[PDB]
Design a protein around this ligand. Structure first.
Ligand code: HEM
Ligand SMILES: C[C@]12CC[C@H]3[C@@H](CCC4=CC(=O)CC[C@@]43C)[C@@H]1CC[C@@H]2O
Length: 450
């Protein structure tokens, strides 16, 4: 009945427990101690963190709970406005943009993106083919080169040309710094203190970087396509008959450029990490890649046939879902789990990595990397596996991400053997989205021509 809560610090309430650069990992440790639900209060906000499938299945009932803008997401509205992921479900532009953009993620759209995804994937493989003997690969850095370029090209017919730069693209640097600031601002007792004026200035500078790139993309399109940008500019919502206005279009462009790259780069990076730490799994995945990818360019159908590679990616998303949060609020008063009364408006936060370690669902070996868990996906209980969120606010990009990641990981496993040459110790960096910081490998080419 009474809800668990970690210790408080006077008027700071629970906030000092989140003074860390790894908040999801810190909150997982609180869930370890307190169980499937605990309340957390800051001077500015209150939420309840959920970790069990039993309770999360209830939170995913859209007749009782709607998507909530949790604190860091509210901060991102300064950049993303009422773009798709940062709008309330009841905000006019959510359903409008959802209706206008959903056909850009049809299976037919995916088939149309395939050749562009191959273009960027081939650039990754060629970069690695061209390294010298004394070199290694910076894995998340190169995955982010690939995933930013892929959403640029597929979504906007724009080439970031990230493989032509040996430093991250400036859009990446500004994305990391802005999302890091949204993460950190949550932990500040007094965010309007002038101590944080320099953080505000930098956040505005990163916002201007993003908006300058949006201007270039828009100018490029004028000076040149059936893609996301086409639908932003020309589509009409079939419900309201209305188009997106120019202000919301700008928010959507930034929205898709950010969301289209970071979680997918983290996934590819974690997937490669788990493969080199589990060589027998790597061998099985590499065997599938060689058996299926018989042509120099993978076809759309061949990527759909990479079943074990798909299982590898799902299992990586099980252990470290790379956007590890989604938040709900109670639409009306209701009792959660038969035990915890909630009031209309009360916030819930789904701790996805902890959901994915629910032993009553997965068994006791929750920490083992075992892609065979996903051999028969219909055998996984409803709402036990939620790396893409829930309901009408689930990830619109889920099929895009998985097709890109399956294609790229398949080509990687076809073209190289991998060495964990530093015996890398997993260090998970959090800037809202997760990545294995510092993960490096050496690739030995299998000498298979493109
Ligand atoms: C493995 C990669 C990905 C993961 C783990 C992921 C995860 C998520 C999650 C958890 C949400 C729900 C957030 C919430 O409820 O507050 C979401 C929403 C979203 N994702 Fe992704 N995502 C991935 C890839 C992508 C890609 C490639 C795109 C774009 C092409 C994308 C665009 C979006 C957008 C626009 C939303 C908001 C949807 C809406 O509210 O209408 N994501 N994603
Ligand atoms: C806001 C957004 C959907 C929610 C994303 C956000 C990028 C950062 C992010 C990381 C997470 O760990 C949870 C999901 C969030 C909070 C995405 C940027 C554009 C998309 O609309």
């Amino acid at each position: 009945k009474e809800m668990p809560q970690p210790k408080t610090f006077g008027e700071l309430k629970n906030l000092p427990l989140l003074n860390t650069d790894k908040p999801v990992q810190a909150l997982m440790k609180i869930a370890d101690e307190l169980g499937e639900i605990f309340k957390f209060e800051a001077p500015g906000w209150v939420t309840r963190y959920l970790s069990s499938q039993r309770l999360i299945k209830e939170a995913c009932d859209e007749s009782r709970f709607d998507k909530n803008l949790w604190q860091a997401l509210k901060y991102l509205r300064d950049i993303l406005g009422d773009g798709l992921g940062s709008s309330w479900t009841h905000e006019k532009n959510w359903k409008k943009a959802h209706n206008i953009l959903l056909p850009s993620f049809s299976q037919q759209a995916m088939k149309g993106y395939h050749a562009m995804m191959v273009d960027i994937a081939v650039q990754l493989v060629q970069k690695w083919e061209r390294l010298n003997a004394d070199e290694h690969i910076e894995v998340p850095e190169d995955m982010t080169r690939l995933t930013l370029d892929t959403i640029g090209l597929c979504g906007f017919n724009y080439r970031f040309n990230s493989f032509y730069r040996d430093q991250p693209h400036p859009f990446i640097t500004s994305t990391v710094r802005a999302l890091d600031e949204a993460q950190n601002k949550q932990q500040r007792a007094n965010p309007d203190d002038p101590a944080y004026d320099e953080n505000k200035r930098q956040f505005q500078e990163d916002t201007k970087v993003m908006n300058d790139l949006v201007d270039k993309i828009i100018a490029d399109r004028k000076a040149s396509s059936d893609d996301l940008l086409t639908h932003m500019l020309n589509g009409k919502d079939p419900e309201t008959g209305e188009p997106l206005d120019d202000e919301n279009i700008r928010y959507q462009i930034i929205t898709f450029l950010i969301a289209g790259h970071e979680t997918t780069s983290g996934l590819l990076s974690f997937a490669l990490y788990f493969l080199v730490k589990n060589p027998h799994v790597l061998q099985k995945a590499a065997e599938e890649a060689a058996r299926v990818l018989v042509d120099p360019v993978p076809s759309y159908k061949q990527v759909k046939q990479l079943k074990y590679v798909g299982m590898v990616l799902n299992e990586a998303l099980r252990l470290w879902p790379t956007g590890p949060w989604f938040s709900l609020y109670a639409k009306e008063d209701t009792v959660l789990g038969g035990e915890y009364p909630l009031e209309k408006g009360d916030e819930l936060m789904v701790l996805i990595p902890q959901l994915h370690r629910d032993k009553t669902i997965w068994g006791d070996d929750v920490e083992e990397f075992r892609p065979e868990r996903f051999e028969n996906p219909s055998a996984i209980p409803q709402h036990a596996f939620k790396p893409f969120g829930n309901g009408q606010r689930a990830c619109i990009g889920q099929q895009f991400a998985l097709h890109e990641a399956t294609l790229v990981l398949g080509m990687m496993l076809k073209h190289f053997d991998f060495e964990d040459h530093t015996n890398y110790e997993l260090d998970i960096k959090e800037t809202l989205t997760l990545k294995p910081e510092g993960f490096v490998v050496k690739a030995k080419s299998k000498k298979i021509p493109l």
